[PDB]
């Protein structure tokens, strides 16, 4: 509470040239950064109290119960192995120098997995983009295949959703005529919502038709 | 604002009635004294005042010819440094200064700034902001004012 200004923040020494009459100090989002000490005339900057987001990495209850907590943004010095990845302080995993495929995406390249190191422990590592393959590039060399392998792959693509339609006057107002009267004042919104839902339903029907009904003769 | 020389407008006067009805504001800037008085009185219809440039350290230049009455004053300022910029002595470098007065909720506000001029026959084209110096907490309705020349 520096002469009235009431905020919570980490106050650290700065380098701002304050002009000798300026007192508070603000930013570009109308916050309240730098504050000048009522007494000693120094200019110290306020920086938001280290807050972030907790992320619990779980390899699945079926496998085991050991979990790891990721404190996004925090610097480990603001709160078992503790590694500082550029995506947060990961507490509950050890950084292995090896590289495997990304099982659980941590952030900023780091990926976690439940492995039996040498014994099951959540580990952390840098995801490998694949195996390095050095193909020869002689001026007079070519690779021509001698055999082939027919592979039938699969692809899943949605077509339509569940056509929904809500009873606006029944959902918003129960069986209460008093309530029905005050929605008539709220305007023509129920009409727009019903029109949007009917359009969505017709659109899903048209999508199904244009995806499956593409031929005229039904072959047997 | 003021550019040609200086030591002429060594003061100002504010007030809405000027008939002993509201408090005034004298900002006379005399020798090493800038005492501002917020008393309520009717001085005269033509506040004339000479220079009397006495270089003595113990002398009063602001005579009693400006006002002729007094009452129960409400506020006064006894700041030692004079509310006036510094004068320069050079061939063509003159002293340019401006005062931005104002009057809002209660406070008056007297922003101010001094600037050197580089040419003697060119217009003062340039940007110069003004920072607050003093804030008088006396609130009074004011609709007119009067300059105090020498």
């Amino acid at each position: 509470n520096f002469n009235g200004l009431t905020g919570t923040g980490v106050l650290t020494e700065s380098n701002k040239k304050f002009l000798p009459f300026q007192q508070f100090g603000r930013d570009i989002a109308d916050t309240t950064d730098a504050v000048r000490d009522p007494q000693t005339l120094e200019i110290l900057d306020i920086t938001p109290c280290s807050f972030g987001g907790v992320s619990v990495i779980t390899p699945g209850t079926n496998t085991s119960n050991q979990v790891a907590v990721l404190y996004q943004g925090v610097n480990c010095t603001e709160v078992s192995n503790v590694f500082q990845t550029r995506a947060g302080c990961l507490i509950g995993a050890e950084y292995v120098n090896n590289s495997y495929e990304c099982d659980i995406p941590i952030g900023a390249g780091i990926c976690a997995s439940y492995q039996t190191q040498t014994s099951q422990s959540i580990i952390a590592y840098t995801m490998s983009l694949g195996a390095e393959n050095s193909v020869a590039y002689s001026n007079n060399s070519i690779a021509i295949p001698t055999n082939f392998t027919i592979s039938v792959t699969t692809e899943i693509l949605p077509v339509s959703m569940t056509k929904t339609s809500v009873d606006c006057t029944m959902y918003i107002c129960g069986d209460s005529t008093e309530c029905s009267n005050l929605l008539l004042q709220y305007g023509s919104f129920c009409t727009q919502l019903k029109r949007a839902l009917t359009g969505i339903a017709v659109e899903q029907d048209k999508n199904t038709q244009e995806v499956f009904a593409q031929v005229k003769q039904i072959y047997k | 604002a003021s550019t040609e020389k200086s030591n002429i407008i060594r003061g100002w006067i504010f007030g809405t009635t000027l008939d002993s009805k509201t408090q005034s504001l004298l900002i006379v800037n005399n020798a090493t004294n800038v005492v501002i008085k917020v008393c309520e009185f009717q001085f005269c219809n033509d506040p004339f005042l000479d220079v009397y440039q006495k270089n003595n350290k113990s002398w009063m230049e602001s005579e009693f010819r400006v006002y002729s009455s007094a009452n129960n004053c409400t506020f006064e300022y006894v700041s030692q440094p004079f509310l006036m910029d510094l004068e320069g002595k050079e061939g063509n470098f003159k002293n340019l200064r401006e005062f931005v007065f104002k009057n809002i909720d209660g406070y008056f506000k007297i922003y101010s700034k001094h600037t050197p001029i580089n040419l003697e026959r060119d217009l003062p084209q340039g940007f110069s902001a003004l920072e607050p110096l003093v804030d008088l907490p006396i609130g009074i309705n004011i609709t007119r004012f009067q300059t105090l020349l020498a």
Binding site: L19, F21, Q22, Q23, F24, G25, R26 | A1, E98, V100, Y111, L123, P124, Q125, G126, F127, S128, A129, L130, E131, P132
Partner: peptide
């Protein structure tokens, strides 16, 4: 007389 206010007259409004 009467003359121009080129661009003079701008002040630091609040003390921030």
């Amino acid at each position: 007389s009467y003359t121009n206010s080129f661009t003079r007259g701008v002040y630091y409004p609040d003390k921030v």
